[PDB]
Amino acid sequence: AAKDVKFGNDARVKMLRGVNVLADAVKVTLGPKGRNVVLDKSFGAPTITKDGVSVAREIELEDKFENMGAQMVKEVASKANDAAGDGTTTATVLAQAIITEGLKAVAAGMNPMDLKRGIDKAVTAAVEELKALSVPCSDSKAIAQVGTISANSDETVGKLIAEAMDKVGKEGVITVEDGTGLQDELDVVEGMQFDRGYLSPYFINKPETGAVELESPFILLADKKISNIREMLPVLEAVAKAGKPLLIIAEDVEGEALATLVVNTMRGIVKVAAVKAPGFGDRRKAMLQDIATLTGGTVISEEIGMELEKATLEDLGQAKRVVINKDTTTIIDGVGEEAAIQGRVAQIRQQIEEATSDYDREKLQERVAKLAGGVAVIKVGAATEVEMKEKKARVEDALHATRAAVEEGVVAGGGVALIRVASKLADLRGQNEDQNVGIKVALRAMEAPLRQIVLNCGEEPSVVANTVKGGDGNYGYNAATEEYGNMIDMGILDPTKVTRSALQYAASVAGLMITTECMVTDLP
């Protein structure tokens, strides 16, 4: 199609306009006292939300270049949110800052590549300082505290999260589920989770969580690739007749088969989800065999001879629940007699015994840990079903925050951590004047989020930022009560992973956008 291209400064100012629109839309929700954003819907009743994720997702500008700028910033912010569990608004605000001062410096005639190098150096030093400043969260008390803080200062949610982590381990698989009755049940079942996401977003059954949930699906395990529909069509017909959903775990599903599956999914004829098998090579075969033993259904391997056409309904695996996220999927309480699992664990143990290379032994150890760890499911209970749904959402959010905290650690929230890091790094220097300008740009950008939070709070951002910079350690400003002091003690927590990932992804997108020289769009 016909293309219109912008070269140099005009493209950059279009980019800046787009990112400014996106960040102005999404930034008012930042902070405990954040403004509301009215999102119009075609249904008739607009949705009033103060969540940055929804506001960012709704933004789609008209001008093509501003639209692309907003789309890149939104994409990197979404990547940060998925990686960490939170911080998309912080990442967007940081990106808008870095882009604004970086493009302002570029217009001054400085070399964009040196600015990018300086920004990257400053962000690397900031990550190092943030790791130094991070407070570890490993014992049960800190886990419970983080869970409580994340779930709007609720002690029950933190207690449940800490109990689950103690039961299954800090690296174990923990899942929430609707619970019957007032009591909150917590039991460990035989399950598995591997980092594999849905093939297409149209497979999503729950748009609220952006995940694919299956009430009680069937498991299809084929080591071959699926491109044609005729081989698997008898199995799909059989499972549709059985009245249950189907999970397809193949090496790769694409072509006509994927399109047919997507069409059947959106038309509501049958609810089936397809996900690629974990790993590659013989590791993928071993994982498929492990899943087969867990779900009690023999894997369809064309090498030994069985085919998809001859596959029976009973040959398919079965499990209680299957949850597929954007990048990870979980199998919960797969049906299968326990001696098979014990035998598989034993064989993996001998494979450890004769394992020679370190990496193969590590992979097999990870395999056996995943297989024998199980899945600890939390069944949230409440007196009222809507209260139960709200508690389930809060518990899921607290679980994400607690997992991030256990991974990295906890640092002062509310933007205080970035302020402290910038104050520590104010003495950093590069190898050129442009690199030094980039470093200063990065430091001011790191200061920006706290300024935005206290601007939403209504105070003067400059005074609060200066006072927080003057302080040391975790001392900061609590916008909820308009008081200073130790942010950790006051209970304003942010996992180190969230802030680190937000800063890194904002820096990445800002470096990409600073060095852009041209863009190509379709004509309006």
Overview of this protein structure:
Belongs to the chaperonin (HSP60) family. This protein is 52% helix and 16% strand. It contains 18 helices and 18 strands. The strands form six sheets. Strands 6, 7, 8, 9, 10, 11 and 12 form a seven-stranded mixed sheet that branches. It has a three-stranded mixed sheet with strand order 4-13-5. A two-stranded antiparallel sheet has the order 1-18. It is globular, with a radius of gyration of 25 Å.
Q: Could you please say which CATH topology of the domain at 189-405 applies here?
A: GroEL
Q: Tell me the distance between the termini.
A: 11 Å
**Fourth-tier CATH superfamily name of the domain at 189-405:** GroEL
User: Helix- and strand-based class?
Assistant: alpha+beta
In the CATH scheme, the class of the domain at 189-405 would be Alpha Beta
Helices, by number, come to: 18
Subcellular location: Cytoplasm
Binding site for ATP: 29-32, 50, 86-90, 414, 478-480, 494
Pfam family, one: Cpn60_TCP1
Modified residues (N6-succinyllysine): 33, 50, 116, 276, 320, 389
SSE topology sketch:
Layout: E1 3-7, H1 9-27, E2 37-39, E3 47-49, H2 52-58, H3 64-84, H4 88-107, H5 112-133, H6 140-150, H7 155-168, E4 173-178, E5 185-189, E6 192-194, E7 212-214, E8 218-222, H8 233-242, E9 246-250, H9 256-267, E10 272-276, H10 282-295, E11 317-324, E12 329-334, H11 338-353, H12 358-373, E13 375-380, H13 385-407, E14 410-412, H14 416-425, H15 433-457, H16 461-470, E15 475-478, E16 483-486, H17 487-490, E17 493-495, H18 496-514, E18 518-522
Parallel strand pairs: 4-13, 8-9, 9-10
Antiparallel strand pairs: 1-18, 2-3, 5-13, 6-12, 7-11, 8-11, 11-12, 14-17, 15-16
PDB class: chaperone
Keywords: structure-function relationship, separating heterogeneity, GroEL
Assembly: monomeric
